[PDB]
Amino acid sequence: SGITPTLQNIVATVNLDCRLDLKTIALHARNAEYNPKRFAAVIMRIREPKTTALIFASGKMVVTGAKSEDDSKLASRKYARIIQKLGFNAKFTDFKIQNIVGSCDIKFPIRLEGLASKHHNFSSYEPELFPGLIYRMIKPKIVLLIFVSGKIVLTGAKVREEIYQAFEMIYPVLQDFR
């Protein structure tokens, strides 16, 4: 047991049941932005939940930036209602979470070279593309991450309690390393 994590990001997706066009969304609204050259899909924002959403030509959606389950659902449903208002037919039916990003700061800096030495059977310490270490912990299945400064980031979970369950079991081992 120990200090609790916090959640900093949420991601969800919907299969909006229609083959909706994009350039109409780019033209009619000030809110939307769009260009195929630099990115594949329309991007939208909205102010009350303070989230961003991506609308793909196949009708599939992604929502980002929410900080709770029901908040993300409210945002996604709101986006679905916006797209319906622009004249396209739509249905908000299938809702699935695809990511969680927990975050916390450990109370001490870490000599994480030992976390490679004693746990390389799961851990990895390469600085080539990112700072800190990666820990592809298998159960609960999250792509855990730790910085040298003690910042710890918990990624890839699908349900809220999973992050807490992962933190509670990683903390005793990182306690050993200063």
Partner: protein, 1514 residues
């Protein structure tokens, strides 16, 4: 760029509204001053209407509006001027792009508003027949705008309620246009729009009904039709149509109400029934219907309608209609949730008959639970105010009505208000059965207490707000009835939950606070005193998790003793199964003290007898485990400590609100102060902060001195704990000659070696935030009486400063080990915190401290200057006129002090802090302090230069629009006179209305020629503004006389006013002149004749004698020094502070790496000047070195200059026609020139003087023999230096060069048979070659003579003055690089260059031996060259180098230099991609392309609010 064009640019780029609304005002006023040139302004401001950014487009629209206010209306009866502009905008009104249509509509809005009455008129046709054209034109514009309204499709869904910016703007423009047209056309517009009602441009009806009100009088059919439309709009399917149709009724209800009984009587019914149709989860249209209903229901005739309807039918009665609102009180969308509160609050104030029905217990209960479960700050605040109004009127009937009305809900709501919060993972849910639904008598995680989703700030705010509400009704209940509330709160006051106990203290705090008289609360004195000063319970139910964690760690240790300590069991301590504070736990349960004793004593006991020998390897793990348990145990204890402090504070504040103060008040004061220091939750801390001020007020009013004095001193100490805002004197006492304002760049500010720094950086600002608010509230409470009755707050603020700075700093202040140093860095912080909210009557007291603060600004210790600069920037920004006149007269002149450095650093630090703190309100005074900052931008010390350029980077952008700024309203004469003086002082630098020629005083000889007078005038111009430059004139001109003129004038002016006024900034200091050593006597004789009053001392001399001037050197007025002794004795000449540093030869310092330049750059001087013959010799980086001497911050860092100029120039070696290799250099040349231009002064001797003789040049070509070219080739087939030297050797009796020289000299009198010739070589061997052949075999007749480096300096003068005066010498043999400065070879006729050199300026300097002032015959120079050889490469490179050297300076003069000197002189924590499988790449596609930031929504409301437009439209 004109003043107009620089000013109008500010409309597009500017710091804030306050600057741009001044820019537009100045632009319009300046147009009013020059009404004839209107379109010159319009063509410049109009193009911003197509700008891509909303924020500048709207202010450009405002500009084209304001600016046309001045012009007269067109009328031919007493070619419409804007016909081109309107013809353009009326077509941009259909641009496919979005931005341009908004711009066009908003521009047409202003044009039609201001000058619509004259639109489309024609010249020379009578009124009755051009009114036709006017009407037709306005109708056509209306037709276009209606077409846009029907075809608009560019909307905004970015918020809960949509908006259509293009539709709103064109609607406003149509509202503007239709005010001018006649009713005959308005009816057609109305009919067309009503057909458009049937998708719909209904906003036109809103604007039509807004601007015109003759129409509603003209016939009833207008009002009937519009509200028939609105009635069939309110009930529409599309929620968007519902909102816009509902909006139209809101502004026009008053002029709507009297039309007819039935229309209103039906409209109100449809409004009510459309409201009762329950809304969707994502429709905000209901919120605006709430405002419509709150508007209609406020007017009496609507009440009459509802009343008679109620008399007809009970189902329609107001008492039954009102509760239809209730289901919306917790609708998801924030807007409607608040709109319902607003409407119901309005219904509360609607009198007696309309309130008595629905205002009953149910709505009180519903609003109370609503305030508890609210999360948005605005909604909770509105609901609390609503509750206050309801309770107030319901009690204003009588107390017994309220008691009978609300007592039915006392138990559940009293239970709910006192409900605890709990720690995150283990919340206590609220009992959901208490939450009565609105229908009968989604976001429910708030009642779950789900702290993980909702931070404890929100929950603590909720509980204290509930207490703040319930303590109100507890005051209006008659006191015999209180038993149900009283017993509940008094039992909660001893609850095992810390949260419940604190909330009970909060409830009594509110009750005692607002109760009519304090003694009504008297029954609670004992139960609050005992909680304040009894020793506390040791366990708290909400904190159980912490001690559970402690037990877990202790169990880990005890198990570790088995697994790793090998301790046999049966004697270990048992750790209890139950943790203290848990329900039904007995006293035997696990306490924190039990853990603490286990963690050391039993630990040691087992270590006495665990596995022997293995102790040494059990030791590391056991010690780590003990450290872990020590980590958790103290954390739990600190958590208890904070919770206990918070409950103690909540008790103390209520008890002081009850006006009880025990005989010795130490426990109260400790309880409050320790909470101010600690509690982080701002909404809770503010309560203690206010009540401590209440305590001070009460103690001092009661006639008690000691406790008030003590506690005010204590919180004053608390004010200064923030190190980052009040630096520690013990750390900085030794630091001088450094400015702390720049020190943030330095390391160790954030102390990376220990995270303890971050802990303290939090904990210090946490206490400061509290103490500062306590001081401010105390100031607000005491007002004008403060310093009369809180004496210590005067003493700490004044007396240390008085003792410190009344005279010299006493020696005690210089010790970091001594207290008095810290006291006077503290006192200025006390002033800095007090003054911005001190009562205006005490401003004279603060102003009486300005003479001391400004004295402290001129002090040695850097920390003192830093605090003085911050304090002065605070005082002068709060008290503006008096503070700034004191500043302008006292410290502003000191900014130019050259004698010492401490004063100047403070004088610039205060400007930096003043600009930063004052912000964009500085405009009334920027003209005072711009040109001192421009002066300091070139100063010696690097700190001053950096701060000065940082300040000037912002200050320069304000000054284009300050010329014309209105005066401050209250204005001391001493400043206004200063303002006029400064305006005229800088006008000569701002425009070509220049000063007349400098009045060189008569003490200097009055013999100056025209160009020399112009040069002295230019040097005086430089001297005025403390600029520096190069007097890069050719030889022979009176450069020495000019520089001495300006230098002597400066010293004389400095001498006189030092005597006139007692100012240290002007007392005399010596100058120095650096020249090549031979010219020392020239300088001495010239200064001795032309400037007799100046003392001169020559530093050059034998070193044993030179040693004697280590201290005497300051006495003189001018020092003369050789470069080559300055390089040696820089160490002792640099220690002084000089005036007007003059270099007589810039060529010596041209190279950055030469030691002499590294020596010269170290000098500190008040003014700098270089008298070089030619700045450019090889490349522009040589000019960079000179400008690095003159003014380091101007031309930029060395390699940045290299990249920008040196390489692009070098690229043009082999330029082609119209190639980018050529164009890059062509760009670079002029880009450098336009920057360098005002600081050089180039004048050709051949253009200024015709007294000196004319000049002719010719090139002489020769052959390349067989043997020569064979040698060339046989070397060619074989570093570059070896080959280059060998080539230049071998390319020189059968050789062509000697033959060419022979045939040239036999083309002269010397060879055929008076005539004189100079022969120049570059290699001494070649001089020998010509010598040993021309007079030995070829032309023995010639009377030759020789002078080169081999000739000793003691006979060169005799040789040269023999040659130039004795006709017998025919030919002189010489090398170009000999002598240089003053070789007198003026008698020559012809100059023959036998070979050439890479340096062009050296060749010109060699030519100047003959082409000199001391001659009148023509000078004819020949250059011999051999076809095809390497000589041609040398000459071509020389041509390119002289080309750039010429064009980089080209024409220069005092008056031809430009006036725009100011324009050049400035020079996430985790990203895991969410568009695919999780990964940390660090860069992703979608967002990084410039998605940017979402705009604020306020800009819509500040541009579409109808009231502002309707005021703007008369």
């Amino acid at each position: 760029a004109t003043r107009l064009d620089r000013l109008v640019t500010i409309l597009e780029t500017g710091s804030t509204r306050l600057i741009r609304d001044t820019a537009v005002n100045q632009l319009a006023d300046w147009q009013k001053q020059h009404p004839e040139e209107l379109f010159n302004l319009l063509s410049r401001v109009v193009p911003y209407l197509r700008h891509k950014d909303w924020e500048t487009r709207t202010t450009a629209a405002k500009a084209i509006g304001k600016i046309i206010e001045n012009a007269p209306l067109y009328d031919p009866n007493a070619e419409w001027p804007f016909e081109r502009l309107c013809e353009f905008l009326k077509v941009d009104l259909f641009d496919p792009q979005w931005e341009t249509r908004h711009g066009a509509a908003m521009g047409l809005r202003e044009v039609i508003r201001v000058h619509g009455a004259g639109a489309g008129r024609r010249r020379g046709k009578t009124r009755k027949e051009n009114n036709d054209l006017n009407r037709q034109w306005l109708d056509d514009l209306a037709y276009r705008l209606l077409c846009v309204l029907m075809l608009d499709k560019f909307t905004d869904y970015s918020s809960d309620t949509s908006v259509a910016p293009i539709r709103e703007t064109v609607g406003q423009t149509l509202g503007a246009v239709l005010r001018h047209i006649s009713v005959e056309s308005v009816h057609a517009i109305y009919r067309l729009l009503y057909c458009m009602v049937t998708h719909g441009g209904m906003v036109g009806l809103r604007y039509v009904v807004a601007v015109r009100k003759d129409l509603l009088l003209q016939d009833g059919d207008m009002i009937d039709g519009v509200v028939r439309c609105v009635m069939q709009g309110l009930g529409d399917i599309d929620d968007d149509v519902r909102s816009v149709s509902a909006a139209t009724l809101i502004p026009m209800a008053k002029e709507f109400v009297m039309m007819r009984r039935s229309a209103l009587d039906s409209l109100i019914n449809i409004v009510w029934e459309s409201l009762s149709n329950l809304g969707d989860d994502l429709s905000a249209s209901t919120g605006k219907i709430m405002d419509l209903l709150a508007t209609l229901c406020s007017f009496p005739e609507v009440l009459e309608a509802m009343k008679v309807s109620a008399s007809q039918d009970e189902e329609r009665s107001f008492t039954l209609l009102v509760p239809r609102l209730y289901p919306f009180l917790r609708h998801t969308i924030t807007s409607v949730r608040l709109a319902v509160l607003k409407a119901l609050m309005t219904f509360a104030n609607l009198g007696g008959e309309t309130s008595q029905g629905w205002l009953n217990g149910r709505i009180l209960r519903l609003i109370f639970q609503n305030i508890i479960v609210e999360r948005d700050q605005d909604t909770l605040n509105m609901s609390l105010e609503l509750w206050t109004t309801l309770v107030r009127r319901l009690a204003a009937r009588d107390p017994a009505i309220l008691a009978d009305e609300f007592e039915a809900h006392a138990e559940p709501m009293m239970q709910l208000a006192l409900h605890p919060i709990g720690v995150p993972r283990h919340p206590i849910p609220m009992n959901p059965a208490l939450f009565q639904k609105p229908s009968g008598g989604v976001d429910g995680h708030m009642i779950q207490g789900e702290v993980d989703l909702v931070g404890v700030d929100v929950l603590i705010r909720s509980r204290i707000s509930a207490a703040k509400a319930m303590g109100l009704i507890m005051s209006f209940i008659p006191t015999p009835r209180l038993a149900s509330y009283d017993t509940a709160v008094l039992q909660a006051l001893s609850s095992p939950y810390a949260s419940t106990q604190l909330a009970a203290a909060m409830v009594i705090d509110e009750y005692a606070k607002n109760c009519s008289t304090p003694e009504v609360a008297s029954r609670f004195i004992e139960p609050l005193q005992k909680i304040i000063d009894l020793e506390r319970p040791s366990h708290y139910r909400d904190l159980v998790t912490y001690v559970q964690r402690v037990r877990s760690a202790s169990q880990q240790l005890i198990n570790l003793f088995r697994d790793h300590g090998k301790v046999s069991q049966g004697k270990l301590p048992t750790l209890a199964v139950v943790v203290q504070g848990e329900p039904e736990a007995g006293p035997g349960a696990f306490s924190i003290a039990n853990a603490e004793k286990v963690v050391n004593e039993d630990f040691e006991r087992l270590k006495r007898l665990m596995a022997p020998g293995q102790r040494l390897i059990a030791l590391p793990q056991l010690n780590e485990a003990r450290e872990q348990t020590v980590e958790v145990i103290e954390e739990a204890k600190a958590a208890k400590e904070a919770r206990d402090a918070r409950i103690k504070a909540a008790a103390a504040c209520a008890l002081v609100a009850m006006k009880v103060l025990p005989k010795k008040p130490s426990p109260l004061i400790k309880a409050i102060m320790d909470s101010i220091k600690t509690e982080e939750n701002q909404e809770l801390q503010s309560r203690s902060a206010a009540t401590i001020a209440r305590l001070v007020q009460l103690f001092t009013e009661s006639g008690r001195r000691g406790p008030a004095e003590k506690v005010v001193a204590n919180l004053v100490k608390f004010s200064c704990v923030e190190v980052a805002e009040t630096p520690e004197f013990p750390i900085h006492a030794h630091k001088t000659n450094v400015i702390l304002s720049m020190q943030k760049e330095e390391d160790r500010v954030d102390h990376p070696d220990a995270v303890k720094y971050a802990r303290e950086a939090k904990a210090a600002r946490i206490t400061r935030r509290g103490a500062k608010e306590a001081l401010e509230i105390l100031s607000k409470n005491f007002g004008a009486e403060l310093l009369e009755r809180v004496p210590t707050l005067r003493t700490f603020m004044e007396e240390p400063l008085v003792r410190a700075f009344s005279g010299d700093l006493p020696p005690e202040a210089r010790d970091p080990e001594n207290a008095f140093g810290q006291e006077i860095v503290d006192a200025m912080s006390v002033i800095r915190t007090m003054t911005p909210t001190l009562h205006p009557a005490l401003h004279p007291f603060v102003m009486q401290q300005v003479p001391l603060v400004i004295k402290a600004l001129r002090s040695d210790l850097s920390v003192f200057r830093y605090m003085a600069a911050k304090c002065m920037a605070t005082i002068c920004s709060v008290i503006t006129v008096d503070g700034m006149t004191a500043l302008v007269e006292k410290v502003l002149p000191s900014i130019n002090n050259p004698l010492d450095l401490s004063f100047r650093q403070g004088a610039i630090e205060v400007i930096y802090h003043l600009i930063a703190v004052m912000g964009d309100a500085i405009l009334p005074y920027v003209i005072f302090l711009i040109v001192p900052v421009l002066g300091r931008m070139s100063d010696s010390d690097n700190q001053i230069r950096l701060i000065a350029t940082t300040s000037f980077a912002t200050l320069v952008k304000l000054v284009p629009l300050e010329a014309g700024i209105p005066d401050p309203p209250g204005l001391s004469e001493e400043l206004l006179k200063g303002r006029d003086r400064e305006r005229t002082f800088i006008a000569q630098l701002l425009d070509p209305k220049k000063i007349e020629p400098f009045k060189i005083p008569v003490a200097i000889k009055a013999e100056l020629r025209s160009y020399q007078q112009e040069g002295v005038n230019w040097l005086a111009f430089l001297n005025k503004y403390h600029l520096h430059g190069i007097l890069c004139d050719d030889m022979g001109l009176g450069k020495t006389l000019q520089t001495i003129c300006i230098v002597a004038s400066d010293h004389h002016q400095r001498a006189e006013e030092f005597a006139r006024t007692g100012a240290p900034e002007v007392r005399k200091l010596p100058s120095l002149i650096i020249c090549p050593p031979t010219l020392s006597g020239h300088w001495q004789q010239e200064i001795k004749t032309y400037a007799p009053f100046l003392t001169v001392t020559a530093y050059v001399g034998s070193p044993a004698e030179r040693r004697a001037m280590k201290d005497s050197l300051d006495k003189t007025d001018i020092v003369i020094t050789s470069y080559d002794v300055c390089r040696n004795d820089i160490d002792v000449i640099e220690k002084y502070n000089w005036n007007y540093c003059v270099l007589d030869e810039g060529h010596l310092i041209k190279n950055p790496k030469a030691k002499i330049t590294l020596a010269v750059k170290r000098l500190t001087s008040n003014h700098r000047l270089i008298l070089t013959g030619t700045p450019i010799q090889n490349n522009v980086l040589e000019l960079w070195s000179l400008f690095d001497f003159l003014m380091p911050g101007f031309l930029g860092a060395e390699k940045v200059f290299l990249d920008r100029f040196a390489k692009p120039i070098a690229n043009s070696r082999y330029s082609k026609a119209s190639s980018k290799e050529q164009e890059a250099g062509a760009l670079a040349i002029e880009a450098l020139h336009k920057q360098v231009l005002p600081f050089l002064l180039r004048r050709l001797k051949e253009e200024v003087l015709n007294d000196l003789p004319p000049k002719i040049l010719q090139n002489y070509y020769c052959d390349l023999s067989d043997l020569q070219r064979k040698l060339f080739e046989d070397f060619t087939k074989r570093h570059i230096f070896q080959a280059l030297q060998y080539m230049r050797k071998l390319c020189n009796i059968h050789a062509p060069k000697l033959g060419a020289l022979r045939d040239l000299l036999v083309d002269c009198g010397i060879g055929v048979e008076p005539h004189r010739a100079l022969i120049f070589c570059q290699m001494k061997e070649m001089l020998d070659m010509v010598q040993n052949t021309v007079l030995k075999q070829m032309l023995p007749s010639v009377s030759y003579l020789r002078l080169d480096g081999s000739v000793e300096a003691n006979k060169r003068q005799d040789i040269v003055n023999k040659f130039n005066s004795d006709p017998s010498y025919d030919v002189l043999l010489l090398t170009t690089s000999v002598g240089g400065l003053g070789l007198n070879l003026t008698g020559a006729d012809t100059v023959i260059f036998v070979e050439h050199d890479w340096n062009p300026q050296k060749d010109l300097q060699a030519m100047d031996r003959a082409h000199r002032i001391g001659q009148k015959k023509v000078v004819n120079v020949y250059r011999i060259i051999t076809r095809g050889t390497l000589e041609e490469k040398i000459l071509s490179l020389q041509r390119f180098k002289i080309d750039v050297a010429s064009t980089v300076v080209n024409q220069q003069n005092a008056g031809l230099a430009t006036m725009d000197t100011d324009q050049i002189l400035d020079l996430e924590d985790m990203v895991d991609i969410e568009t695919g499988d999780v990964r940390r790449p660090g860069k992703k596609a979608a967002w990084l392309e410039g998605l940017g930031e979402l705009w604020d929504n306020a800009q819509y409301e500040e541009s579409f609010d109808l009231d502002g437009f309707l005021k703007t439209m008369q």
